């Protein structure tokens, strides 16, 4: 099945114009926890925001245009992106915006981190209804020695 | 001669003990090219902030409390850690803020970090008398993909 991944500041801010203005070594280890083995999918954008293909991971990277990278795979379509996934019981797409956008009618779950961050953004996690939406955990942490916000961990299955 | 490190965001406000609102990969890449290969010294509060022995560097805690760890060299006073540094060109003192109280007057030279966001915060580095001080090396860099905010890079000699 298809998940999406993502950390949501207030008002369901995804990305700014530069880098996120929080440190949360936490949110990265559980967002590589729920991504380990797994094939990910992302948008171009993000791919050259991470620098690096993630490792342990199979990389697809949905796009128009040319792929620049070869140790990843470049697709064109969003059926090209889930067909290159091959056999696997969970997809995971981690963004952006528009690749959360197009992917979200076939999700069946969401892994989000609410953060509370009060910014500026320039993209937002698409609009979901929460009467379409179970919430099966969450989990409260306060900011602490490592990690300058506080944050949610969540997860939701589609009802 | 003792020097001390550290990241201010405006006003002077520094970590207290959560960590700082922001993410610059290329501001702790400036922290380790500049305190690696030495001694650093640092407070309780620091030592948890990071979370293990910097590598490269030798370790000093200066602190009322006790030496949970023995991979690092715990210290009680300042005269202590000084001598624990031995005979070395120059000794980092990278904080927090009563650790920086304590060895300002003893300092020769002043490695800062000035950024551009505006925390609240209750600790603020010590208040230094730029006539006292040459400001010998100033770069200012802007906000990008990786750096949440804009930031620059300082050198101060204490005339
Ligand atoms: N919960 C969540 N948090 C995020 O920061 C997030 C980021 C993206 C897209 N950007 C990124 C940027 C860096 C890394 C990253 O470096 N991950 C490493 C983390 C280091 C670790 O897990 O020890 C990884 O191996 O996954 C991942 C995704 C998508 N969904 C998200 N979802
Ligand atoms: N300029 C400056 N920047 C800081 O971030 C700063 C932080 C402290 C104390 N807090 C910390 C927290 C983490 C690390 C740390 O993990 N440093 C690694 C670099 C890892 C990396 O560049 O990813 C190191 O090896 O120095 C150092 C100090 C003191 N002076 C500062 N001074
Ligand atoms: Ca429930
Ligand atoms: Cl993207
Ligand atoms: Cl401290």
Same mark, same amino acid.
């Given at each position: ?13 995804? +990305?700014?114009? /530069?880098?996120?203005?929080? /440190? ?9 926890? !729920? ?7 992302? +948008? ?8 690096? &293909?993630? &490792?342990?991971?199979? !990389? ?5 245009? &040319? ?28 963004? +952006? ?49 490592? !990690? ?12």
């Amino acid at each position: 099945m298809i998940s999406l991944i993502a950390a949501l500041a207030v008002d369901r801010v995804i +990305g700014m114009e /530069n880098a996120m203005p929080w /440190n949360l070594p936490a949110d990265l280890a559980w967002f590589k926890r !729920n991504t380990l083995d797994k094939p990910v999918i992302m +948008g171009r954008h993000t791919w050259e925001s991470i620098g690096r &293909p993630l &490792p342990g991971r199979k !990389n697809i990277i949905l796009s128009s245009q &040319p792929g620049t990278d070869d140790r990843v795979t470049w697709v064109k379509s969003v059926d090209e992106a889930i067909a290159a996934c091959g056999d696997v019981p969970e997809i995971m797409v981690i963004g +952006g915006g528009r690749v959360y956008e197009q992917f979200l009618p076939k999700a069946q779950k969401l892994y989000l981190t609410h953060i509370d961050a009060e910014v500026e953004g320039d993209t937002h996690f698409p609009d979901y209804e929460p009467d379409d939406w179970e919430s099966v955990f969450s989990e409260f942490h306060d900011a602490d020695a490592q !990690n300058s916000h506080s944050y949610c961990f969540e997860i939701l299955e589609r009802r």
